[PDB]
Amino acid sequence: VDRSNFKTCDESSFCKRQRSIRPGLSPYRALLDTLQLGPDALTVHLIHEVTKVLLVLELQGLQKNMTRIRIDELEPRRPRYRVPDVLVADPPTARLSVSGRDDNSVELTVAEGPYKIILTAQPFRLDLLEDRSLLLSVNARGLMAFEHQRAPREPGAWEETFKTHSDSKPYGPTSVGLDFSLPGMEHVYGIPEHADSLRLKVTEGGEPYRLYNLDVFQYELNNPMALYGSVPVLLAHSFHRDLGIFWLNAAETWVDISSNTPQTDIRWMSESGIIDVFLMLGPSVFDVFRQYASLTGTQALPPLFSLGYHQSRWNYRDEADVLEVDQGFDDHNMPCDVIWLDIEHADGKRYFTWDPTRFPQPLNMLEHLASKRRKLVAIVDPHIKVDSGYRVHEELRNHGLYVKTRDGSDYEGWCSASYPDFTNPRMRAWWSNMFSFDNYEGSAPNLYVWNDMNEPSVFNGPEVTMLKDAVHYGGWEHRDIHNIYGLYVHMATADGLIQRSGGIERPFVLSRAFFSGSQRFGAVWTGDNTAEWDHLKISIPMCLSLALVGLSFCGADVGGFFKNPEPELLVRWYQMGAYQPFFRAHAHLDTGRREPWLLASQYQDAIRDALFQRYSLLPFWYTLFYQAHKEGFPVMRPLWVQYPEDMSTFSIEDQFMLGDALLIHPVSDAGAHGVQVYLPGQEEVWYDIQSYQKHHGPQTLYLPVTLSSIPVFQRGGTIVPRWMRVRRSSDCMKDDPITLFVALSPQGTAQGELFLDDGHTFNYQTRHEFLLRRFSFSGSTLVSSSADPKGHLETPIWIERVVIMGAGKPAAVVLQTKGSPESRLSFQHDPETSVLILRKPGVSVASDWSIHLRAS
Amino acid sequence: FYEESKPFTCLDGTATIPFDQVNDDYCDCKDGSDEPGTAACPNGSFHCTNTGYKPLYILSSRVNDGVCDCCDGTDEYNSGTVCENTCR
Ligand SMILES: *[C@@H]1O[C@H](CO)[C@@H](O[C@@H]2O[C@H](CO)[C@@H](O)[C@H](O)[C@H]2NC(C)=O)[C@H](O)[C@H]1NC(C)=O
Ligand SMILES: COCCCCCCCCCN1C[C@H](O)[C@@H](O)[C@H](O)[C@H]1CO
């Protein structure tokens, strides 16, 4: 990376001004005579003792253990930005009652308790408690700073230059900032996107973490530089409790983290807008996930194919190359659901077009892929070539839908191109309509989309993005809206794919840039990584930081984007990627071809094995995504989420869990012959899924590995569903029989769910056409029951096999199901591993049934 | 009185099963020899008879996968993809 192209805090005048304020007595005080209390909010005026500027605090108790704090100017020269379209609803409130009051303090009870809020007038402070336990303090270090809007027109407070770019800054200094104290918290996470550790570092002696969507060429590791996306949500975990802080601000934001009896302090500093913060009081991490999901929504349910394997590069040359790649997967018995078309497929990077030499017959190419039951993804970026012959440009120019400069002319980034104003709802409607099959000529139902460079990336712009003083819908400046620009591109594209099908088909859109709420629109990836071992390692903490803040559909380019990976690294990357939510191999223009059959046989075989593992686990992945969509729980999880009292798991980032059932420790070092696997849980057992060897927790196991090894353990007490008949794509498999893998707990019990639907439409929601089954094992009986009786589905899917780990040899196996006579199943048992295989149950997955193991 | 027919033995000698477990859509033989007509075995093969032309073998996982693998279309017999004969 070239660090000189990106501002450090000292080079961002508002960060330098805010950060220069050091801990001390706050000049802000609440004027308690102005206090007003209603059923939905408490309001009170605050005053800066020196400047005499008046602010208004709107304090609200909310349902589901949350508190909202909003601070704005009492009499502003002009309205300040308030983030739209991120919140899914107006949050239901909880009544605040005065339970104590003196000349300097007011104690408020939330509903009928146990939560309480103490407002201190001088210096202004808020304390949040549950009964007598102090959870969080606000402005404890006196770092609140609210720069009021001065008469429009010291160093860099007004006009400001960065390199050769001048920001005219018409409104001058308007930054806002506030600090929070977390007693008992030593571990904090979130605020992606940074190529850094899962457990966030203290920023005291260096740079704060930066949240400003930026295109960072050849980004480096273990540093706080802002990357492509920004989710201003921070989670705090201890043995005793979980808390979350959601700072709803779309402007450039810097986050300072400091430690201190153990306590972590967090400071947020934003360029513009209001102070709008949600405190999510848990108490469990799952309660924090539900709290945050109630505010910004849940992960969109991916169509099943998008959970398969994706093959990409910059670029497949032409139709013949795409068809050869497609045929290559089949000739080498490697499954693949999607083939991707990067920027060279279009007519000279005019999006929604096709190069007439490379792709003369796109509908025919799509029909060929459809005959193989595969899909294609085409790239569509939010920069429009300034060309009078280009219909998209002509329409956007004619309708005035581009981002403008202050003089009212359409902004042009030279290399020229204009930028549609995705903050304008009419522009988003126009964009969505461009995805109709009539408008996007050459597109078909098996064509999906990739939104790249949507930070927006502007080659000749400051920090490779848009000028701060560009003008958007409603007269807002680019500085006010920056971090939601990408999200709007993602949202409008997803809406386009839904609309083109008449509202029936679920979308699939991959986006580079993102914000809070982006989980509602599709997948994201960690951008332009590098073909190196440390970038393979960092894919875990980066996608975990994303999972914690609601973005479950995350991945990193398999093999690395830049440079040529050695074959061993490519194998380990396929193994890692096979156990991550978004699974795509991708590569830069100047790299050698790396389709997996180009390697020597040993490497091809290890890659095929990884692909087979992923495809067989599709029913499990689909069920975890359904649970993310319904509950807001992450798909990929840090171990501390499942073991909140195990302090040894709090910083782990070389392993992760999928739901509560699988623990994964991918090999991530060249020449490794073993891995140290931490298997947590005081009364827990773990089964090595390859050998069926049982291991008791808590322990660190040194597991031997070969090139084809993927260290995966199933937790005792779980039931994992698989499609053991691996075919060429997920569409081929989606009506096939299921094998249930039952891992018995030490108490001889297990449970697990399975979600099934048609794999691609909204029929599960509009017609309740789906199944949600619960499988439960206890005593010597395995039972299938409905986990949601509203869901009905006509399906040929049946149970072909049951594999029970930790079981003794029965004398007889009996299956009962309504409408059939009692059945006797044959079985096989390995006494060394205590693995029992039940042959061909033969029952519909839609039916209730029971299998009883008789000791007879 | 009545003599019973003998059971099926896997071509690899790993098991002996009644002929009702042959093409019963469950894999009983380690070599896949009990399921030549279905997608049940991970190492099985399906024979494209391609009457009049060169016969071909395909992977068992390509039986009723909804994709036309045999030129005679016999690999797709219960999938909802109706394959045309393209052997010529
Ligand atoms: C809201 O907060 C309350 C209080 O912390 C939660 O209730 C507690 O849940 C824990 C388990 O996490 C129990 O040990 C306590 O006994 C419960 N306390 C009380 C007073 O009920 C509650 O679950 C939270 N609710 C939501 C929706 O997040
Ligand atoms: C200082 O930088 C000098 C070099 C910069 C030159 C322009 C590079 C444009 C690349 C755009 N785009 C970025 C995506 O993250 C990739 O996944 C994708 O393959 C690629 C092509 O569409």
Ligand SMILES: [Ca+2]
């Ligand atoms: Ca059989």
Ligand SMILES: [Ca+2]
């Ligand atoms: Ca077929």
